[PDB]
Amino acid sequence: TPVTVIGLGAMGRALAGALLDAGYPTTVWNRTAGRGEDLVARGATLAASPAEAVRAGEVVLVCVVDYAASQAILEPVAADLAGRVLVNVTSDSPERAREAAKWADGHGIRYLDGAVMIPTVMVGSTDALLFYAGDKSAYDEHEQVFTSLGGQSAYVGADHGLAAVYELSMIDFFWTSMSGLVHGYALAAKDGVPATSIAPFLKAHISLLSLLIEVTAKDLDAGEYPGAEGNLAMEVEGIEHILHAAELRGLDVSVLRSVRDVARRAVDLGHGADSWSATVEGARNP
Amino acid sequence: ITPVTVIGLGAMGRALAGALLDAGYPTTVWNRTAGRGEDLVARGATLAASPAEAVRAGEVVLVCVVDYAASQAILEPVAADLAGRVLVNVTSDSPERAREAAKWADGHGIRYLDGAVMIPTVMVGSTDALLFYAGDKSAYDEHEQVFTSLGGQSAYVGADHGLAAVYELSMIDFFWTSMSGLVHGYALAAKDGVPATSIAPFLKAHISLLSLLIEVTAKDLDAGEYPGAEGNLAMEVEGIEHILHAAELRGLDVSVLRSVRDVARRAVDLGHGADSWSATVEGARNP
């Protein structure tokens, strides 16, 4: 199967590299020249025009981050895209993904919206996780192409905005947790403790989080948050002691204060006696 | 065998006593309110009439009250019986409070260890339970087996008694912030009709990534260098703005995300756009 990658920014180069590693004939195209010289030596073919690149591929991966740049490239070649499988990976909104789906269907293009959930350095590895939503027969026909991009690839449904839904929900958790990791290290460093001294111990809380990922999901789906294991009214207090310790040390505490605000909102909504899962009510009713 | 005493029979106190009984230590317990601890007496603990009898029955005295002031209230009248013993306060406290408690114990001849329990009560006593201790070094080493019984990953972190709270506060800062984002990610998905149990198995990929970045972030922060050719703050910030906008469009509270983004933007305005996420530490230090 011939594959074409459009856009050779960091993501596009990684995706093309993963396809070449898997042994697929790979054609690349970038607006700015010299992004693909390393790929071309590896075995990739550089294309003059986007219309040429699209015609070289049964599956077309489009990796241009700007929507306007992406649409200005794809629309004029919609006639050449017809009958091929188009896959958009540039992270976006579910609504933007749905609009591409409508444009693509009105032109007879089978369309998959994708989300890369791991850093570019892990693209192509057997535990890389990528999400795909859209044409089911397109995914099944070229499933091993997508398995080549990441062995943990998962199709999440026919609605094209679902890949973005899974993606943004996951990176909502990820960037928020990376915010607290840096903040926790910063806190310790105000008292002279190196981050490398805490780091081995944080693995206890990673195993804890893994457990609560499941408990929290159950609770959120049931709509019931049992108070046992301590109450939200006292968890708000515990978080206020972190806030206290960090502001006395001169750190920006805007995140912790926001975390406390949503919990206090939930307490004020009658969840003072409930578990941490009940903070979802604070998030839904500001 | 070393006789041990637990004062304070809240949830934490009862778990600490139960772990001592599991390991076979003679355990004497005390609570202010009658009715907590009959389960522990059924398993072999001895209930003491007053705190002074409890402290006199133990070489090691574990105090597990809700607050430091409460420990002082129970400890001050019995400070004469503690002289020459080992006192551990597992009650949560600030590092500054822990250093004051250290002074109080010096004036009475008490070896003092400040403790912090880092896992839920249900795992107290387990081989991978983690507890921190800071303070008199001979107290920890002489009774290390007692402390390992409460949690097999127990760790003494130094002579400054406030260090146990320092380690603990850095960790639960990461913990509660992550739990806040976990709830938020599920709510975001629930807005498009996706159940949280459908997201949950995929969140395991990001747990291992977090596991990896724990090490990477610690180095960068310790060295003062944030190499960003592995993914730069400027387009990490824009990715966060996509979460923010999508969540706001759906009527969710976005105060956490806006604060996450702003701390990051601040680091970008300080010239770290091409550096890694670790460089956000500069926005956290300079609001």
Chain B residues inside the 8 Å CB shell of A280: 183, 186-187
Q: Residue written as tokens 């960068």? A: B220
Structure tokens at B244: 């923010």
* CATH number attached to the domain at B201-285: 1.10.1040.10
Comparing CA positions, the residue from B153, B148, B155 lying closest to residue B134 is B155
Distance CA B268, CA A151 (A): 34
Comparing CA positions, the residue from B29, B26, B4 lying closest to residue B12 is B29
Positive or negative, the Cα torsion across B171, B176, B179, B185?
A: negative
Structure tokens at A102: 């409508």
Same fold? A3-158, A165-284: no
Residue in chain A closest to B239 (alpha carbons) equals A91
DSSP B280: G
CATH topology for B4-158 is Rossmann fold (3.40.50)
Tell me the CATH architecture of domain A165-284.
Orthogonal Bundle (1.10)
Contact yes or no for B146/B22 (Cβ under 8 A): no
> How far are the Cα atoms of A132, B153, B154, B203 from residue B143, in angstroms, in the given order?
56, 15, 12, 40
Which residue out of B226, B250, B255, B261 would a mutagenesis test of the A interface target, given it has the greatest number of A Cβ atoms within 10 Å?
B255
Please identify among residues 251-280 of chain B the ones whose CB lies closer than 8 Å to any CB of chain A.
251-253, 255-260, 262-263, 266, 277-278, 280
Distance CA B33, CA B27 (A): 18
Chain B residues inside the 8 Å CB shell of A125: none
The answer to whether the Cβ–Cβ distance between B257 and A176 falls below 8 Å is: yes
At CB < 8 A and 24+ separation, what contacts does A131-134 make? A131/A156, A131/A162, A131/A163, A131/A166, A131/A167, A131/B202, A132/A87, A132/A156, A132/A163, A133/A97, A133/A157, A133/A158, A133/A159, A133/A160, A133/A161, A133/A162, A133/A163, A133/A164, A134/A101, A134/A110, A134/A158, A134/A160, A134/A163
Chain B residues inside the 8 Å CB shell of A118: 205, 209
DSSP B252: -
> How far are the Cα atoms of A27, A241, B100 from residue B96, in angstroms, in the given order?
63, 12, 6
Contact yes or no for A264/A237 (Cβ under 8 A): no
Comparing CA positions, the residue from B158, B142, B172 lying closest to residue B60 is B142
The answer to whether the Cβ–Cβ distance between A198 and B170 falls below 8 Å is: yes
Closest-CA distance, B200 to chain A, in angstroms, reads 6
Which residue out of A67, A121, A178, A208 would a mutagenesis test of the B interface target, given it has the greatest number of B Cβ atoms within 10 Å?
A178
Angle (nearest 5°) at CA B74 between B73 and B75: 95
Closest-CA distance, A235 to chain B, in angstroms, reads 9
Chain A residues inside the 8 Å CB shell of B154: none
The answer to whether the Cβ–Cβ distance between B281 and A182 falls below 8 Å is: yes
Cβ-based neighbours of B264, under 8 Å, separated by 6 or more: B233, B236, B237, B240, B277, B280, B283
Closest-CA distance, B218 to chain A, in angstroms, reads 5
Domain map (residue ranges) of chain A: 3-158, 165-284
- Amino acid identity of B102? A
Which residue out of A92, A113, A160, A172 would a mutagenesis test of the B interface target, given it has the greatest number of B Cβ atoms within 10 Å?
A172
Chain length of chain B = 287
> Which class does domain A3-158 fall in?
alpha beta
Closest-CA distance, A79 to chain B, in angstroms, reads 31
Q: Does B212 touch chain A (CB under 8 A)?
A: no
- How crowded is residue A202: how many other Cβ atoms within 10 Å of its Cβ? 25
> How far are the Cα atoms of A269, B189, B213 from residue B168, in angstroms, in the given order?
30, 32, 19
Please identify among residues 24-83 of chain B the ones whose CB lies closer than 8 Å to any CB of chain A.
none
For chain A, how long is the longest CA-to-CA vector?
65
Comparing CA positions, the residue from A229, A282, A206 lying closest to residue B174 is A206
- Cα dihedral A260/A261/A263/A267 (nearest 10): 130
> How far are the Cα atoms of B145, B238, B274 from residue B242, in angstroms, in the given order?
51, 6, 19
- Amino acid identity of B139? A
Q: Please give the order of strands across the beta sheet that includes A110-116.
A: A45-46, A26-29, A3-6, A59-62, A85-88, A110-116, A130-134, A154-155
Cβ-based neighbours of B93, under 8 Å, separated by 6 or more: B67, B68, B101, B114, B165
Closest-CA distance, B53 to chain A, in angstroms, reads 30
Resolution (A): 2.0
Q: What is the CA radius of gyration of chain B?
A: 23
Structure tokens at A80: 């050449």
Q: Identify the experimental approach.
A: X-ray
Structure tokens at A188: 């310790």
> How far are the Cα atoms of A102, B46, B62, B110 from residue B51, in angstroms, in the given order?
74, 13, 12, 16
> How far are the Cα atoms of A14, A65, A280, B82 from residue A6, in angstroms, in the given order?
12, 11, 40, 74
